[PDB]
Design a protein around this ligand. Structure first.
Ligand SMILES: Nc1ncnc2c1ncn2[C@@H]1O[C@H](COP(=O)(O)OP(=O)(O)OP(O)(O)=S)[C@@H](O)[C@H]1O
Ligand SMILES: Nc1ncnc2c1ncn2[C@@H]1O[C@H](COP(=O)(O)OP(=O)(O)OP(O)(O)=S)[C@@H](O)[C@H]1O
Ligand SMILES: Nc1ncnc2c1ncn2[C@@H]1O[C@H](COP(=O)(O)OP(=O)(O)O)[C@@H](O)[C@H]1O
Ligand SMILES: [Mg+2]
Ligand SMILES: [Mg+2]
Ligand SMILES: [Mg+2]
Ligand SMILES: [Zn+2]
Ligand SMILES: [Zn+2]
Lengths: 364, 84, 699, 97, 637, 66
């Protein structure tokens, strides 16, 4: 665990799990750099194969010119080039990417009145841009030290990442895979010729739910969706199907929504008023450290190409009402803030659930 | 580094609870969770800082307690406990 | 050496300086030369600024070209490198400076007596060193050559006060007019107004003109140009120049006596002996006509130094001509690439598009235009119908808008209480009666007008806000629209859809002409002498005769009583009036001009100067017209009592109605340029009050 | 997701529902709750999880927690003439859980 | 002198001699500058000294030199620039600033994103598409300073360079600003003879359309020089072609000692403001001579109004008068600016209210897709500060700046409002000024300014009861203030009346509309969505070059040519008709959906003027007035 | 870089090396080639110095010209 990291693990390989707060921008570190003296014009190359250092230059430019110590020329033309006389020739130097990640212990197992502790991690080369913030990862890495300029000799620990394992992979457009192997192709083709295919796909939809066969047929049709059309005049016809299930409490509509969230390749289950801290539709908020407009989140946009299961669909804000309307026909959300103007994709099928007023339904 | 205040039961009426700062060494780390009454034995000494304090205008030092021992003033069942 | 290489430029500063001297002596516009009368007034301490006209220099080069002699293009040299030509003119002016006719006295400025003492002290140094060198008698021997050599050795061995420490005048550049350039086939970049976008890095060092609105004006502060120090050890005064935003003070004395001596004296600052400039920083923003499609307006910094301070105020359309100069970089050190520089405009000339009413002076050229407009007759109707010539009809509305522009007489009593002289006019009417066009026209005509949409301005956007000025580094109060329209007209469009905060602010403004703020930042009162022109719709958006006029004018009785004139602008359909309205509107759309050719509409500048001259008047009332006003007030109150129970009530008669009648009568007397209020003025005032409400509703 | 004003460090707080995972959450004064806390309770009883999309963090936290809540009836008294839903400001879906 | 430099210069000489398009582009730039200089001498604009180079033609000419520009631009771009400068100076002898280069074409793996840019693309020519978020103030940078020595009367100069202005790193020699010559005499700075080059910093962020939906966005910095400044505003979608370069030492000296790393930015060579949907860049299309002749051939037909209208949205059945109104809105009338400063509208505003599921949102989306500068907003989603303007705080200067809302960004364009009836009251008051005075006046704490919001507003609304009732009067049906209705020129009540033959027409049209495939697509293959970015310069399916129905891409060119070319003026034969119909409409006894105010009169004028743009006629005739009148009558009755 | 620039020289060492190789294997003054016999003597440790005759190279160039 993150709390059992002691001073016995320093400069050792440790395997440790948690969740990721933030992924920093990619900094450019130097692997091979060519240098040339200011007035001596001595050309030299420094190759670097160690990039684990943080807050400090473990390999820097030489303090003095190397022409005198090498004695490369027999002519050997008191002359001093000066302190730090080398200039990096950038169009002949080679660079790699480096990233700062921030890892917290999981908030499920934290002391009740205490701050969750966190560590900074550094990754490089092909370990960068492999994980998004919020994913749960176990990471193998060197538990190392940097000095930051609270105790006469106190050092800040960090992790040099040697490997990242993703326990669970989030579902999104960019994380979706379109590659298929020939065995899965053959299995799907063999499945498609079954004459009772409709019956078995309806039976596979929530086998623990008694009845509601027409609802399960509707759910299969929603999962497939229809053909989308783009016409020469530019207006588009949508293929996604939006199904409302409204009825008495205790009729397993929420369980149908949950099963649709489980079976869909991309899905999000939210309430009519959103989530605890995840909005519905689309939220545009200012960036934390640079104060720039960006898309904060939202159920209808994270579930692009998927299904949003809106439980308690009748209780909903007026913002979310108009955004849901525009997303159900147009499959787009139009954002016109004071600084940002965009029309962003919301290609999502909506499966909504509702409980009518006065408790049970009234036939009158 | 652990901040300790006087227990609110024992403070005289009009006075605020005083606080000190306690440094826990290698084996004493993560022993006392916050919110519990604990008793620390340790060496009372001065924390040295650069150029003292400019706001006070007086040569005033801050104080720390380097903890020698920590004593607390558990859902573990033994072999007899499960039989019970 | 080749480390500082040299280039050859077509400019030569010797023949141009000789041309400058010849221009200063021999220019006569057509007592004696212009710039020797001007320097005579400067030397007599009757003039503080020397304004050099590029029209004058162009004309001077023109008669030199007509005489056949060869003259350099001094105007283009100024327009390219005006910063050097400032001290070139200053040196030429100091070369031939007339002696003052009037002796110095005790009613004279402190800087002037300091300058006189400096000149006399320099003369005493020259005379004493001449006497010592002549008394030495080195050679004991050509008298004129000996005197010349002795003068040259005296002037090279003595340290005098420099010329810069002896100027009592500030020198500025007036750009050449476009018409004078059109006469003489000259094309100058200085004359044409640019926007902030059009002012690029290729205009640096050039005398250029920028057109725009002033958004921010800093307070006048003393910016030190040269610092004076006194040394008790040697008695010298040590002056160090300052050309940056920050300086390091001098500690040890740098005079020759202390430089040679082993013991160094200590310098003490002397603020009376040091040279300061009145400094202001202003922000100019390009007009909406200059902003391209889909863009946000940007700003430019204007530096005002010397006499030209307090000539720029926020909310002014202005052409500012100045030298475009760079400044050291302000910003983050990480974001700079090379020698990045900030930019500013060292102001030389200011031209206001709308001239202030308080700035009006009865000059010679104004008088013939005013007398022409008087002799044309019927100036009340002529100025009324020419306010918005492309808005058909609404003659009485435009008449009361003209009275809004002129206003009445502000009254002060020795008891201390004040009665306002400004008139507040409300236009409540059906949609599509062109009342927003009237608001735009009125506070585009007025020099200090502000157009405001009801929800476009919040409570902080009307009264005040406390915020920091960094150039003077102090926490100042910046007013809203009711401060920008002080001694002007505040156009408040969509009056009925406002919040209660702005309603209360305007409620206090229309009576006490102040805003009182008692908040967590400030406890103050601030003057707002605005005349308020409001535009509004009825309750349902349309007037319906089923309910009372008070009912569908959803307006409280107090704020209703504060308005002197409220116009019901009803859109009543008819076969005949719609024909003429359609013909008027279609003619304006086809010909881009007013239909009626039977009258010449009066130009906005002409109306502005006539309204200023009318506002100079302070008419009074005699006993007979007071008695007529009293009788009219009595009958008005009895009529309002009689019609109170009926559905035809527009309200209840008020002493504020009496004061509004008095103010409208005073405005009408001001339009006639009379010191007396006549019976016909009160006749027109009562007629206007009646036609504002009763005439259109009864029909 | 909260940034400390002094430490300038962004931390992810799961809240009392995520913090009570495999345990019990005790919510005193369940009636005068605000809207965001009601939504959090609704999600924590429906999905037994809490989904966050804040500050670049989009994830779900397990909230398998039992809830022992305490509430006061409307007006300060229980009225036995009216049924339960009219004595409490809680709506039907949260009362049914 | 370097041998490989001269070899590459000669190779670019051969490339420029092979393709004469760059040669006569240089010719056209030089003759434009020469005629402008000659017009300034006798009685203006100066084109920059840079040439757009196609990378595909270079790839066809020399693979090695093309790969050299793409992979090692520091060694290949300066020889090409020197070659272009020598070519320009070869023909400039008969009639001084060195010529620059810009690049277009396919970049292959170098067409990247601010997220996709990593350190493997350093010292390479990259084409990055994104959105401009921050634009620094255009600051002059001193290149050569000129000084005067009054004692000797001589002019000196000093040149200044930095690492940004060069692609190849040289020895940094900091030459201080000379205040004194070699002999010891004081120098006076000669402003006006010194040279300053405009410098700009922009920040390019990944587009929100192509960004991951929950992650923080990645951004890059781009440096622009004199001819490339002020080509962007914040909120634009852009394509920046430039060299991705690292500068300085990343803490590897003693003085620096930090982990900012090596600072990375893009030396901008080319800036293309891309047009995107609901953005601030207007779509512009190059009008060839053949397309101009085609447009003039359309304009001569008598049926011209009914082809361009019916060719708007052929996949929507009916709504023909709405198509006519949308076409006239796209034409946009003529804006009058009177001599005293008063202003008259030209823009046409359309409101559609009626039953649900009646092609209102689809028509709004069509106007968003086919207009040059349409911006889409919804009712509750954007607010009073969202549509008009807001105030923010600058980091550098510390003073408040403005952020432009939907109306300001859509200046000279279209604002497409969906769910118009769900606006807040303060938003409605904000709309009142925009729809008539065409401006936004903001008076905030310290900021008082007017922004140009000359917009055409097309809006979709629903009745308060969810359905339109014929027996009930429209005042309670629309339930909107009469000022707002007077703002809208044409109000259309769309009713979903149920008829058997009408429903059959609906069904046949929709079912024939749902049976379409694009060319080059198989029967079962799903259609792929490609995001539409267009470069901004300066039910029958088989519509190909005006057979019966006009294509949308040619409709765009017709609209652009009509808006740019013809500015029609009224004459008496149209004025008589307009006056007579306005007088009849003002005094008619028939109940109407919208009240008849004075605005309606100008509405007629604008509508008539719009029809004159359809015919490409400099004159507004009687037929234009009549078609304006009977389009207004259908909307009113 | 520009600190070590380049010039173009008429000498080309690749074709000159090929000419040297061909001259060594094909020169026959008038057993077999001359320098091949010399290199056989060197490889047999009977000759220690190889003398390159420039009249031989001139004759080789002239016969290739012929
Ligand atoms: N027909 C059914 N077959 C199987 N399980 C069922 C059935 N009806 C209800 N259940 C179960 O009983 C519970 C009912 O919960 P749900 O009905 O999903 O809640 P809901 O009432 O539909 O949603 P509300 O109205 O917001 S409380 C679940 O645990 C279901 O698994
Ligand atoms: N009497 C008139 N003469 C000329 N043009 C007029 C007249 N009345 C209205 N108009 C025109 O009709 C329009 C009126 O616009 P506005 O100035 O907004 O009128 P309004 O009374 O302010 O409407 P609101 O905002 O609903 S009170 C403009 O295009 C005017 O040119
Ligand atoms: N006249 C019509 N012709 C063809 N399709 C139509 C027509 N009216 C409505 N539709 C269809 O109905 C669907 C509903 O969208 P829309 O009618 O725009 O919603 P709303 O009317 O609520 O704005 C669209 O996908 C559109 O294809
Ligand atoms: Mg449920
Ligand atoms: Mg108005
Ligand atoms: Mg719709
Ligand atoms: Zn060296
Ligand atoms: Zn001294």
């Amino acid at each position: 665990p993150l709390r059992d990291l002691d001073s016995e693990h320093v400069s050792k390989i440790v395997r440790l799990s948690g969740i990721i707060i933030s992924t920093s921008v990619l900094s450019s570190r130097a692997t091979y750099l060519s240098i040339m003296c200011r007035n001596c014009r001595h050309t030299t190359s420094i190759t670097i194969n160690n990039f684990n250092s943080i807050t400090g230059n473990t390999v820097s430019l030489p303090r003095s010119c190397l022409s005198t110590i090498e004695s490369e020329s027999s002519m050997a033309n008191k002359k001093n080039c000066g302190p730090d006389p080398y200039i990096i020739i950038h169009e002949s130097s080679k660079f790699i990417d480096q990233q700062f990640l921030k890892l917290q212990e999981i908030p499920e197992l934290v002391p009740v009145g205490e701050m969750p502790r966190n560590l900074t991690m550094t990754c490089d080369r092909y370990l960068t841009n492999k994980v998004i913030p919020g994913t749960r990862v176990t990471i193998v890495g060197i538990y190392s030290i940097y000095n930051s300029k609270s105790g006469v000799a106190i050092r800040t620990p960090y992790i040099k990442i040697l490997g990242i394992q993703s326990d669970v992979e989030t579902s999104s457009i960019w994380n979706s895979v379109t590659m298929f192997t020939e065995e899965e192709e053959e299995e799907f083709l063999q499945l498609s010729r079954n004459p009772k295919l409709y019956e078995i796909l309806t039976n596979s939809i929530a086998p623990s739910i008694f009845g509601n066969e027409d609802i399960k047929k509707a759910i299969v049709c929603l999962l497939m969706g229809g053909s989308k059309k783009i016409l020469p005049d530019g207006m588009r016809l949508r293929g996604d199907i939006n199904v409302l299930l409204l009825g008495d409490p205790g009729t397993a509509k929420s369980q149908l929504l949950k099963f649709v969230e489980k079976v869909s390749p991309i899905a999000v289950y939210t309430s009519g008023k959103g989530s605890s801290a995840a909005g519905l539709t689309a939220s545009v908020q200012r960036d934390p450290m640079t104060r720039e407009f960006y898309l904060e989140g939202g159920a209808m946009v994270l579930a692009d190409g998927g299904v949003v299961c809106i439980d308690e669909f009748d209780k909903m804000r007026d913002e979310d009402r108009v955004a849901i309307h525009e997303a159900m026909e147009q499959q787009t959300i139009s954002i016109a803030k004071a600084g940002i103007t965009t029309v962003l994709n919301s290609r999502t099928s909506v499966l909504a659930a509702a409980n009518p007023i006065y408790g049970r339904y009234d036939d009158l | 580094r652990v901040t300790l205040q006087e227990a609110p039961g024992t403070v005289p009426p009009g006075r605020l609870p005083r606080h000190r700062e306690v440094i826990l060494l290698a084996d004493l780390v993560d022993v006392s969770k916050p919110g519990e009454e604990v008793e620390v034995t340790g060496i009372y000494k001065n924390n040295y800082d650069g150029n003292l304090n400019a706001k006070n205008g007086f040569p005033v030092f801050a104080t720390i307690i380097e903890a020698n021992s920590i004593k607390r003033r558990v859902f573990s069942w033994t072999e007899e406990e499960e039989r019970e | 050496s080749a480390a500082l290489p040299s280039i050859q430029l077509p400019v030569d500063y010797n023949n141009l300086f000789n041309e400058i001297t010849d221009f200063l002596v021999t220019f006569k516009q057509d007592k004696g030369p212009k710039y020797m009368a001007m320097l005579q007034k400067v030397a007599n301490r009757e003039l503080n600024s020397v304004i050099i006209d590029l029209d004058d220099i162009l004309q001077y080069q023109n008669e030199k070209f007509l005489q056949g002699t060869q003259a350099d293009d001094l105007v283009s040299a100024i327009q390219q490198n005006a910063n050097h030509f400032t001290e070139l003119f200053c040196r030429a002016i100091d070369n031939n400076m007339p002696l003052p006719t009037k002796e110095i006295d005790y009613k004279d400025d402190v800087l002037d007596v300091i300058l006189n003492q400096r000149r006399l002290r320099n003369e005493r140094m020259l005379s004493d060193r001449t006497n010592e060198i002549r008394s030495e008698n080195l050679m004991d021997t050509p008298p004129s050559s000996m005197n010349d050599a002795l003068r040259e050795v005296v002037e090279d061995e003595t340290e005098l006060f420099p010329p810069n420490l002896t100027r009592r005048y500030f020198l500025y550049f007036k750009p050449l007019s476009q018409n004078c350039a059109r006469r003489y086939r000259k094309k100058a970049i200085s004359s044409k107004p640019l926007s902030v976008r059009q002012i690029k890095g290729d205009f640096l060092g050039q005398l250029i003109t920028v057109r725009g609105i002033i958004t921010r004006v800093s307070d006048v502060k003393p910016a030190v140009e040269v610092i004076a120090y006194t040394c008790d050890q040697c008695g010298y005064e040590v002056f160090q120049e300052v050309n940056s935003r920050t300086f390091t003070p001098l500690s040890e004395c740098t005079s020759e006596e202390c430089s040679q001596n082993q013991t160094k004296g200590q310098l003490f600052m002397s603020t009376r002996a040091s040279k300061f400039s009145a400094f202001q920083e202003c922000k100019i923003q390009e007009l909406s006509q200059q902003v391209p499609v889909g863009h946000i307006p940007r700003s430019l910094n204007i530096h005002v130094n010397g006499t030209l301070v307090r000539s720029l105020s926020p909310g002014d359309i202005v052409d500012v001509t100045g030298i475009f100069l760079p400044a050291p970089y302000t910003g983050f050190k990480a974001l700079k690439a090379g020698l990045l520089t900030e930019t500013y405009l060292e102001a030389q000339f200011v031209r206001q598009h709308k001239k202030k009413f308080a700035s009006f002076s009865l000059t010679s050229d104004v008088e013939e235009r005013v007398m022409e407009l008087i002799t044309s007759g019927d100036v009340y109707n002529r100025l009324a119908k020419s306010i918005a010539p492309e808005i058909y009809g609404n003659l009485d509305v435009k008449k009361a808008l003209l009275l809004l522009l002129v206003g009445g007489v502000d009254k002060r009593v020795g008891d201390g209480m004040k009665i306002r002289g400004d008139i507040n006019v409300c236009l409540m009417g059906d949609p599509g009666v062109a009342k927003s066009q009237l608001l735009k026209a009125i506070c585009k005509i007025s020099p200090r007008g502000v157009y405001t949409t009801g929800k476009g301005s919040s409570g902080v956007g009307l009264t005040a806000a406390v915020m920091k000025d960094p150039v003077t580094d102090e926490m100042i109060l910046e007013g809203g629209a009711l401060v920008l329209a002080d001694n002007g007209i505040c156009c408040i469009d969509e009056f009925d859809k406002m919040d209660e905060s702005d309603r209360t602010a305007i409620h206090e403004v229309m009576e006490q002409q102040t805003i009182s703020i008692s908040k967590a930042g400030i406890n103050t009162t601030l003057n707002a002498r605005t005349s308020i022109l409001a535009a509004a719709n009825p309750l349902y958006g349309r007037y319906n005769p089923r309910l009372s006029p008070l009912d569908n004018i959803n307006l409280p009785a107090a704020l209703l009583s504060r308005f002197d004139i409220l116009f019901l602008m009803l859109d009543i359909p008819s076969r005949d009036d719609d024909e003429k309205l359609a013909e008027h509107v279609t003619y304006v759309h086809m010909h881009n001009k007013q239909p009626d050719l039977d009258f010449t509409p009066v130009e906005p500048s002409k109306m502005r100067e006539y309204i200023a001259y009318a506002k100079t008047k302070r008419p009074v009332m005699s006993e007979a017209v007071n008695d007529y006003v009293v009788q009219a007030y009595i009958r008005l109150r009895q009529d309002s009592k009689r019609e109170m129970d009926s559905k035809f009530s527009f309200g209840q008669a008020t002493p504020r109605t009496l004061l509004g009648i008095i103010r409208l009568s005073q405005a009408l007397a001001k339009l006639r340029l009379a010191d007396m209020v006549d019976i016909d003025d009160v006749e027109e005032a009562l007629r206007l009050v009646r036609v504002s409400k009763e005439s259109l509703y009864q029909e | 997701v909260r940034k400390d004003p002094i430490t300038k460090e962004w931390t992810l707080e799961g809240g009392a529902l995520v913090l009570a995972d495999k345990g019990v959450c005790l919510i005193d004064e369940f009636d005068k709750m605000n809207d965001q806390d009601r939504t959090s309770i609704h999600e924590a009883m429906e999905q037994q999880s809490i989904s966050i999309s804040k500050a670049g963090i989009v994830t779900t936290l397990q909230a398998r927690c039992s809830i022992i809540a305490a509430a006061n009836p409307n007006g300060g008294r229980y009225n036995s003439t009216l049924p339960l839903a009219q004595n409490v400001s809680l709506t039907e879906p949260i009362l049914s859980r | 002198p370097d041998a490989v430099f001269g070899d590459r210069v000669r190779r670019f000489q051969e490339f420029l001699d092979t393709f004469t398009s760059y040669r006569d582009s240089v010719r056209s730039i030089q003759v434009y500058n020469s005629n402008n200089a000659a017009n300034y001498n006798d009685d203006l604009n100066i084109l920059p000294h840079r040439i757009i180079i196609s990378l595909d033609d270079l790839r066809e000419f020399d693979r090695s030199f093309w790969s050299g520009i793409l992979v090692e631009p520091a060694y290949f771009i300066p020889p090409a620039e020197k070659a272009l400068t020598d070519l320009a100076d070869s023909m400039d002898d008969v009639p001084r600033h060195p010529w620059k280069l810009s690049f277009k074409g396919s970049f292959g793996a170098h067409a990247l994103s601010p997220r996709t840019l990593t350190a493997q693309h350093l010292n390479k020519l990259v084409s990055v598409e994104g959105i401009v978020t921050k634009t620094s103030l255009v600051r002059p940078k001193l290149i050569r300073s000129v000084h005067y020595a009054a004692k000797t009367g001589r002019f000196h100069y000093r040149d200044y360079t930095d690492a940004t202005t060069t692609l190849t790193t040289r020895i940094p020699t900091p030459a201080i600003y000379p205040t004194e010559d070699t002999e010891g005499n004081k120098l006076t700075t000669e402003y006006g003879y010194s040279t300053f080059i405009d410098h700009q910093r922009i920040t390019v962020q990944e587009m929100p359309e192509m960004a991951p939906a929950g992650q923080l966005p990645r951004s890059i910095d781009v440096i622009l020089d004199d001819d490339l400044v002020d080509k962007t505003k914040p909120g634009d979608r852009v394509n920046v072609v430039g060299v991705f370069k690292s500068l300085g030492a990343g803490g590897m000296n003693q003085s620096n000692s930090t982990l900012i790393g090596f600072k990375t930015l893009i030396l901008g060579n080319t800036v293309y403001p891309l047009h995107a949907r609901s953005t601030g860049v207007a779509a512009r299309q190059m009008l060839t001579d053949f397309d101009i002749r085609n447009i003039n051939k359309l304009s001569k037909k008598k049926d011209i109004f009914d082809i361009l209208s019916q060719s708007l949205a052929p996949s929507i059945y009916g709504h023909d008068h709405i198509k006519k109104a949308i076409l006239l809105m796209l034409m946009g009338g003529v804006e009058k600016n009177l001599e005293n400063g008063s202003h008259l509208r030209g823009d046409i505003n359309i409101l559609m209210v009626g039953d649900p599921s009646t092609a209102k949102s689809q028509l709004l989306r069509f106007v968003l897709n086919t207009a040059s500068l349409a911006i889409a907003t919804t009712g509750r989603g954007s607010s009073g500060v969202g549509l008009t303007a807001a105030v923010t705080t600058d980091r550098e200067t510390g003073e408040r700046r403005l952020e432009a809302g939907a109306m300001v960004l859509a200046d000279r364009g279209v604002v497409c409002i969906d769910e118009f009836d769900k606006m807040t009251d303060v938003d409605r008051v904000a709309i009142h000024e925009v729809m008539e005075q065409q401006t936004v006046t903001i008076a905030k704490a310290g900021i008082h300014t007017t922004l140009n919001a000359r917009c055409s507003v097309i809006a979709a609304a629903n009745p308060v009861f969810g359905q339109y009732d014929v027996n009930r009067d429209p005042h309670q049906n629309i339930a909107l203030p009469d000022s707002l209705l007077s703002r809208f020129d044409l109000l259309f009540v769309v009713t979903d009346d149920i008829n058997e033959i009408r429903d059959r027409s609906i069904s046949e049209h929709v079912l024939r509309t749902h049976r379409y495939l694009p060319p080059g697509y198989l029967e079962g293959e799903p259609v792929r969505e490609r995001l539409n970015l267009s470069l901004a310069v300066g039910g029958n399916y088989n519509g190909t070059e005006i057979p019966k129905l006009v294509t949308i891409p040619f409709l765009r060119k017709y609209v652009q040519y009509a808006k740019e070319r013809v500015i029609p003026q009224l004459t008496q034969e149209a004025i008589n008709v307009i006056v007579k119909n306005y007088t009849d409409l003002r005094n008619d006894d028939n109940t109407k959906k919208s009240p008849i105010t004075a605005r309606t009169l100008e509405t007629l004028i604008r509508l008539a003027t719009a029809h004159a743009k359809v015919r490409l006629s400099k004159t507004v005739n009687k037929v234009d007035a009549k078609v304006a009148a009977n389009l207004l009558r259908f909307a009113l009755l």
